[PDB]
């Protein structure tokens, strides 16, 4: 829902879900591109922490 002004005051769960989906899309694209080992380890580790 927005506030008086009009800027949408967004919830925290939307930040969390949007982070997980951004990272998951990045990880699918790197497994498409066949990135090396350390790149996809950091990518999956960032998804795990997300």
């Amino acid at each position: 829902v927005p506030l008086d002004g009009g800027r949408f005051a967004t919830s925290d769960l939307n930040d969390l879900y949007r982070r997980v989906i951004n990272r998951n899309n990045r990880l699918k694209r790197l497994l498409d591109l066949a990135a090396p080992d350390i790149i996809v380890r950091n990518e999956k580790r960032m998804l795990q922490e997300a």
Partner: protein
């Protein structure tokens, strides 16, 4: 012999990280210890001394190397894995895909109101560069002409 390594920067300031890295090299004049810098990850041709490691992590807006450990960080999976990743990105931009429709063959539409619809090419026109395919819209087949790039081969 200089082997490759992966550097993590603040994603978005990557060109400025690359420029500041070249400038820190030409400041602290370890010119014989750095080969190139390729572009959120920055590829660096390098050797491993602890002095050069402190140099790259003292470059601003750089988090650190990405490897097995932080004592002796890790080169790469393949010899030129950084170059392979760059080539894969370039091939990804090109995105060459099966996109056509010939007589007696199902095709896919991804352009115009008929996008997200499949159909078959009853007639083909290589001279006019147009495929005659109909889309099952509200049941009735909707024979429409689509270009090879306008539709994908099914």
């Amino acid at each position: 012999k200089k082997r490759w390594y992966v550097v993590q920067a603040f994603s978005g300031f990557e060109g400025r990280v690359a420029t500041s890295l070249r400038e820190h090299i030409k400041l602290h004049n370890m010119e014989d210890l750095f080969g190139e810098v390729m572009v959120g990850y920055v590829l660096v041709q390098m050797v491993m001394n602890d002095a050069s490691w402190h140099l790259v992590r003292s470059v601003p807006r750089v988090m650190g190397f990405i490897g097995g450990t932080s004592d002796r960080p890790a080169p790469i999976s393949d010899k030129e894995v950084d170059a392979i990743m760059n080539r894969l990105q370039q091939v990804g931009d090109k995105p060459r895909p099966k996109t056509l429709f010939e007589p007696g063959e199902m095709v896919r539409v991804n352009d115009g109101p008929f996008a997200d619809f499949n159909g078959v090419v009853e007639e083909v026109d290589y001279e006019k560069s147009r495929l005659k395919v109909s889309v099952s819209i509200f049941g009735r087949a909707t024979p429409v002409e689509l270009d090879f790039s306008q539709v994908e081969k099914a």
